[PDB]
Every structure is written in C-alpha cells, then in structure tokens.
Paper text:
The overall structure of FabX predominantly consists of a large canonical TIM-barrel fold subdomain at its N-terminus (residues from 1 to 266, including β1–β8 and α1–α11). It contains a FMN cofactor-binding core that consists of eight continuous β-strand–α-helix repeats (β3–α5–β4–α6–β5–α7–β6–α8), and a FMN molecule is noncovalently bound inside the core. Moreover, the H182 nitrogen atoms of the sidechain (Nδ1) and backbone (N) together with four nitrogen atoms (N1, N3, N5, and N10) of FMN form a positive charged oxyanion hole located between the H182 sidechain and the FMN cofactor, which has never been observed in this family. A chloride anion was found locked in the oxyanion hole and is stabilized through hydrogen bonds with E175 and G180 mediated by nearby water chains. In addition to the canonical TIM-barrel fold core, FabX was unexpectedly found to contain a small [4Fe–4S] cluster-binding subdomain at its C-terminus (residues from 267 to 363), which has never been observed in enzymes involved in the fatty acid synthesis. The subdomain consists of six α‐helices and two β‐strands (α12–α17 and β9–β10), and four cysteine residues C300, C304, C308 and C320 hold the [4Fe–4S] cluster, a second electron transfer component other than FMN, through coordination bonding interactions. The FMN core is located near the kink of the tunnel, whereas the [4Fe–4S] cluster is located at the end of the tunnel where it blocks the end, and is 13.4 Å away from the FMN cofactor (nearest atoms distance), which is within the theoretical distance limitation (<14 Å) that electrons can directly transfer.
The bifunctional dehydrogenase/isomerase FabX is an essential UFA biosynthesis enzyme in the widespread human pathogen Helicobacter pylori, a bacterium etiologically related to 95% of gastric cancers. We demonstrate that the [4Fe–4S] cluster functions as a temporary electron depot that receives electrons from FMN and sends electrons back to FMN to achieve independent bidirectional internal electron transfer.
Numbering used by the authors: -2 to 363
Amino acid sequence: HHHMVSTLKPLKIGKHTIKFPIFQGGMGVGISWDELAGNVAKEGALGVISAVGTGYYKNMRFVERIVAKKPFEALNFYSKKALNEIFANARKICGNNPLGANILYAINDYGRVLRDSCEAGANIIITGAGLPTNMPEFAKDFSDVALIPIISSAKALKILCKRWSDRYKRIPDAFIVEGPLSGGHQGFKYEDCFKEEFRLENLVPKVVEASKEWGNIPIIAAGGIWDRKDIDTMLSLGASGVQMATRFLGTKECDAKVYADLLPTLKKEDILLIKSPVGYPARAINTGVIKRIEEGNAPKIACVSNCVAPCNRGEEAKKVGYCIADGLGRSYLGNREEGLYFTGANGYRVDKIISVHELIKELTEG
Ligand SMILES: Cc1cc2nc3c(=O)[nH]c(=O)nc-3n(C[C@H](O)[C@H](O)[C@H](O)COP(=O)(O)O)c2cc1C
Ligand code: SF4
Ligand SMILES: [Cl-]
C-alpha cells in the first residue's frame, strides 16, 4: 500500500533510537502489554509496556498468591514473572526495536519494579504520578537504560535536573510534558484541570526553554495530540517528539479488549474528571465502578493488592469510593459492571478501531 515516505526524523533517547518521534503512552492495567507495545515498536515508534498490575496477566497465571481473586500484596500485583513474560512476548514481535516500561512513582515497591523492568530488557523507564527524584538510585546497575520523568511544569524539570545532578551526577534522558487533556492521572491540582494557562501549547515552550540550561534534553509532548497536524504543532513549539495514548487505545492490538467495544460508543458527556486513591485527578469514563458508586452498589473496599503508597492501605480508596487496583484489573479481565475505565479528553472521537500499522502510517506518512 502506498504511503509517502515520512519527513519525521528518528529520535534518539540516551543510547536508543526510535524510527519515528512518537511514543505510545503506557496504559495500565493491562492496556499496553505485549500485543500493543510489541506492535508499536515493530512499526518504529516507542512501544511502552505498563508495569502496573502485571499480576493480572492471563488471569493471574503467574502470581504466587491470590486472595479474593485479587493478586496478594505488591509482590504479586507487580509480578516479576508476569513482567518478564510480557516483555519476552513483546520481543517476539518487535525484535531489537526499543521498548519502554511505564511505572507510576506512587506505586509501592517502586524501586523493585524499576529493577525488574531493566532486568526484563526495557530500553527506557517512564515515570509520572510523582516527582521521581531518586529514579537513578534504582537504575544504577543498568546504565544503558534511559530514564524519562513525566512532568507538568518548567519548575519540575529544573528540580529534577538539579537534584539528580547533585546526587547522582546524572540528569534525565528526556522529559514527557503531560498536559491536562491526557488520560488517567493528571499532573495538575483538580482546580487547575480546566484552566487555559496549563494547556499543552503553553507548557511546551516553557519546558523547552528550561531544558536549554541542561543541554536541550529532549521534550516529549503528551495530552490531546490526535493526528499529524497536532504532532507538527508540538514539534514547531520545540518538542522533539510526542507521546500519544488515546489513539492507540483505539487500535485492534490493545491488550485490554474491552476498549474496542467501549470506545466507539463513548460520548463526550461521559468523560469525567474524578478523584483517585493515587492522589491526583484522573480522567475516566462514566461507566463500570463509577456508575456503581452512583447507584450505591460498588464493591466493598478491602486492600489486598496494596498497589500505591498514597492510598495508605485503603484509607484513600474508602474516601474516594473505589480501589484502583481492583477496578483497573477488572477492566483487563473484561468486567463491564465493575471495571474502571480511563480515557483522554479526545476519547469520544474514536469511531472505528484500526490496526497499529494503519495508525502509524496515518501519523507518519509525508
Ligand atoms: C486508558 C489510559 C490509561 C493510562 N494509564 C497510564 C499509566 O498507567 N501511566 C502513565 O504514566 N500514564 C497513563 N495514561 C496517560 C498516557 O500514557 C498518555 O500520556 C496520555 O493519555 C496522552 O494523551 P492522549 O491520550 O490524548 O494521547 C493513561 C492514558 C489512558 C488513556
Ligand atoms: S485499597 Fe488502595 S492501596 Fe490497596 S490495592 Fe486498592 S487502591 Fe491500592
Ligand atoms: Cl496514570
């Protein structure tokens, strides 16, 4: 099939080069695992395996202990064996094309999961949901692995570079700037999530300018980027690449097969900004456990997987009404009644489900 050769340039992040300056954003739980990330990387963009809740893989085939049908504790929720299998299966598809691992800073056992991801063969670690000031501590035995914090401000870039340099004589290999149209957790206070000051086109120049002090660390723009026109806009503002997730949530290869049923139906009015036990606002779909909370028949809360430090073993889950480990795991397992479902602001524009191959050609041709 004819597609004009791309005029986008390969992107180098630390020692690793991707053919197109595009990341498929990590998506937990079980949304961007081996089929999605492996195919993205095969097509020459960065495939990103989510390392969160890997115990759910293949309906908890790889955990050591199950309690109440949930992976027991962080040891089993972030399953090393499952993570190894996901990366191995991804490599069957993409070979030496680089892969990232996405790890929220908020998770319990963060350092162990970072090391597991390096040991599983990741080229790149991507971390948001916090200010990951000690990320090099856990990566120092794997100096080939590139490290990429997700930030929302020039301030955060400066703090991370200062503190990493002072303490590890290292600075990040790239930064992802995640704007307020992104799916999942926002890097903004709730009251700032619908404020034009923080729209991505305003953030990118400020972060790029701050990056000059440190040698023009590549800035990767994320949140609300839909097509090549939006990619070109971000590159013209000084970004070196983009990270996109909602478009990939709409592909056949997505590992959470429920989304191919749900997304073509998604109406804009059903896109919500909700509280989360992680402690950041989250963009979610008004369906599943969120509807059960409204009805009053949502699952009782009981911290089994101990997924994130901010929740304090159920304290915040009880306040917000749901357990994010249980809810996200249920969605990977196909549970429409009690799953938790995330989306970017653009999720309502997904009409048809296309292949990763077709998507990458659409975004890169010309
Ligand atoms: C369904 C879904 C799940 C997500 N889960 C994560 C996650 O686990 N970790 C993370 O850093 N970002 C997560 N995100 C954010 C994406 O990686 C990405 O940065 C953002 O959605 C990009 O905006 P776009 O969706 O408009 O392209 C998620 C996004 C979506 C849509
Ligand atoms: S109760 Fe809180 S810490 Fe425990 S598994 Fe649920 S969201 Fe995670
Ligand atoms: Cl998130």
